[PDB]
Symmetry: D2
Subunit: 285 residues, 4 copies
């Protein structure tokens, strides 16, 4: 029962027809906030992990250690909480590293992850090179007897086109991927078509706030037939805007000016104070 | 010149009479935002580090590794950037650990840190036990020939009173602390009096947004005579409020709805994209 | 089946009468060597972790992060391998930290750990203060529905005597500890008596190579009735002697001089080369 | 003066004609032992770091985090100690990562490092691709105003031949590398010739204990004209042999049997006990 996110996510995917909405989180505060609000699944972003943990742009700076550490932290805030889908980029190396990444994610209670066809160093590797990554990942999840949900992501739309994306996804499905992710749709028509081309194999829609793809609402994605929808930049973007506006006020007016109900104790409560108090009180000292 | 934050902070303290304003930062995004806005010094919070890196409340959960890792990351985002003052709590153990903490902070380019009299396990240790911590810290900075600014913090006001705080600060000053921090003033009158009681030794004012102490503006603190003013919760609080409001919108309306100018590229730029592009372009491949 | 060390160790303890021999390991090489030789359980030492990962003496320098990272690494080298018992010292703080430590160890596949009565800063805490630690640990293992084996260690012999040790162990057993560890026996007679005083509750014997306690062989400990025997310094000590002798030869003779069969490939094989080759080959690229 | 390893190594290289002997170390114990014996420079191995910290073979499993953490630990055991040369492999990614690696190594007090032409995923990249790595590294050391010693390593001998190695080294020298390393000489004649072909630019000889290259003594390497000689596997190999023999004795005879003078206190002394005692005693509590 505890640390069973993979099993939980797989249940949502196989035993329900609901659109699994996963807000993009990147640290403990953002994750705890999504938990407070009752989201049924969370998504740990690579760009957010990089920006927050390393203060760097999303240019393959975060490696396995950074990603696993952030995912291990987020997925286990509540041992009985919502499953976590995490970006696994290209696996951080050759097949040995892809396998290591999947094993570490599995061990860390991560529910699933997306693995792409980009070069590790928008360019994609050959179809065969991509399948080497998928194969390594699937073999690992099978060897570990895990319900881990492997999402096959293809970034080939821009450079190779729609047909190539569909063929790559079909090939990934044959290799054992559980869900497909065609990144960067140019239109809503194209998004609905990818779903129909791969049906009944489930697809995941990646919504990038203020990105280059069209706006698709949760209701629209559900009607299109997607099974999972992740929200990249959903928390990093508003956090930045708020931090910036507040700091400008401090710089120019000499006061922080945050609404008074956002107290240190409220933040501690969002971050697990009650669980800590129960441990402390239960211990009798 | 690079990694010289301690020297820079010491210059501001000794060669100027300005009030050094340090917004409380807790991750790469918050730190990069403060940098973008031109703050002359930053403050890394313990509560924020704990909430963001660990998703936990501020109950002595973050230890040396967590604190040093976050401080090392923040202080070095720009090798030629603003100095970083970091919370060092009680030093994470006995004198061996206090010394290790100071050494690690120094090695990591941290400019200064505050060390308190709280129990490690509001209660404070004896005056002598506190001085053991200060002594260990000062000896370390001296052995390493560093300009590190050691701030002696006392949390004794609530349980022991004002006089005790003043005597503890005077004792810490004699042991080699560079700045004093009387935590949790109950009034503005009391804040101005502490400054006068320790003059000309410099004091630091810790402003806790939405906390239990009275509101003191930057102009007021400057007139009171404080030399440094740190802003606890200045970025963690508004980040939470914004993340929460956005996620409620996603949950109930199906859209994130973040102002359109907060794009992934703008976030990357705030997080060092230009520096990365210069490295990439300069390398010729 | 994978990551089931706790269940495996508990099976050995409850379903067999064998003396579980656990060599003290401290890094990947020492652990892989014990695995190569077929040991049924391993013991991760605190002194060894500190010396190897931090290059420091055993003076409460390693904290939770260091210990969990080394244990997570060792326990999972083989997902289907031998259980790992790890030192957990005093839990690295108050009950909140004791609980965090147990939870992290459990999550990391650690099979069991020893928790002591020493001060965290040979002195021991009060009986009640020690029971607060045991209580926190037991409650955590129960909340997580884990088979984790909690070993209650008492370091009270020197300062308080034998009777006090026995009463502390009995109290720990009542609080839920699974095994007792009376550290530092002064004689073999005393060791056999502790076993008889706590029978049928199982005891663990800690053999410290070149330490201050008398030499007890595996056969002797088994006859005395101990159920687990750990070997502190079993690998760190000979590694040091060998490294020293080799480096003296390099310094004075200009050659390393290591027996020729200890090749880089043999070391890689000990360290999992075959598993890596199977992943690489299976991936098809 | 403290944390000045780069300056110290550069002094040995530029102001002396001595052969700088660097034993390969991989953890705190091995490094502390080399320090105890008075070695003037140390070499942190990649294979050893991987085996010890990760328990894995040398197959690009250790990434920047692992390498920097081990190097940061080793180089700073004594702030006034011997310089550390560390393996930096291929820089762990494209130029952005090469630069990040050099910056992190510099910040961590590392004195120098070797950067190679191998593929990151014996094969080498094109000459131009290799120079991109060297360029990124050199630009970083210059931007940081560091004395860091960059060693250009070429693994091209096997697949491309001697001439190609010499041309790659000459090109690397023009880009700013400080020392060259032609890896894997097939004979002593070839080693002396490489030195003469690049004279007066200094070369480093990598001695791999029980490897595939011929045995060259320190006296011989000095006469050949090499300026630095590193000893890969010098400590990992004998540690393994000793750990194995000891564990076989424990398994088959029930006793560890380590010479009695290798006591826990002696190991603590090798690992910095005296420094810790001075901190503890000096603090007055
Ligand atoms: Ca990514
Ligand atoms: Ca639940
Ligand atoms: Ca307010
Ligand atoms: Ca604090
Ligand atoms: Ca500047
Ligand atoms: Ca928008
Ligand atoms: Ca211990
Ligand atoms: Ca097995
Ligand atoms: Ca040999
Ligand atoms: Ca290497
Ligand atoms: Ca010296
Ligand atoms: Ca012995």
């Amino acid at each position: 029962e505890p640390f069973s996110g993979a099993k939980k996510l797989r249940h949502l995917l196989e035993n329900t027809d609901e659109l699994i909405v996963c807000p993009g989180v990147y640290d403990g505060l953002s994750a705890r906030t999504a938990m407070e609000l009752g989201f049924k699944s969370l998504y740990m972003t690579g760009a957010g992990t990089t920006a927050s943990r390393l203060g760097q742009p999303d240019l393959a700076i975060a490696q396995l250690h950074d990603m696993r550490d952030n995912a291990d932290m987020i997925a286990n805030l509540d041992p009985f909480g919502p499953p976590l889908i995490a970006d696994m980029d290209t696996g951080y190396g050759g097949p040995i590293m892809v396998a290591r990444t999947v094993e570490h994610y599995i061990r860390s209670g991560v529910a699933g992850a997306h693995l792409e066809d980009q070069i590790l160093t928008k360019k994609v590797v050959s179809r065969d090179e991509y399948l080497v990554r998928i194969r390594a990942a699937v073999a690992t999840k099978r060897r570990l007897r895990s319900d881990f949900v492997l999402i096959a992501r293809t970034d080939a739309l821009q450079s190779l086109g729609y047909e190539e994306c569909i063929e790559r996804l079909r090939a990934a499905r044959d290799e054992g991927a559980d869900v497909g992710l065609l990144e960067g749709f140019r239109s809503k028509e194209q998004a609905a078509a990818a779903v129909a081309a791969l049906a009944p194999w489930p697809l995941l829609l990646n919504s990038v706030e203020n990105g280059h793809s069209p706006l698709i609402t949760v209701e629209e994605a559900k009607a299109m037939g997607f099974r999972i929808m992740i929200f990249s930049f959903a928390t990093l973007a508003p956090a930045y805007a708020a931090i910036r506006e507040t700091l400008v006020r401090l710089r120019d007016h000499g006061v922080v000016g945050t609404p008074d109900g956002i107290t240190p104790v409220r933040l501690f409560e969002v971050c697990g104070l009650q669980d800590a108090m129960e441990v402390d009180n239960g211990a009798g000292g």
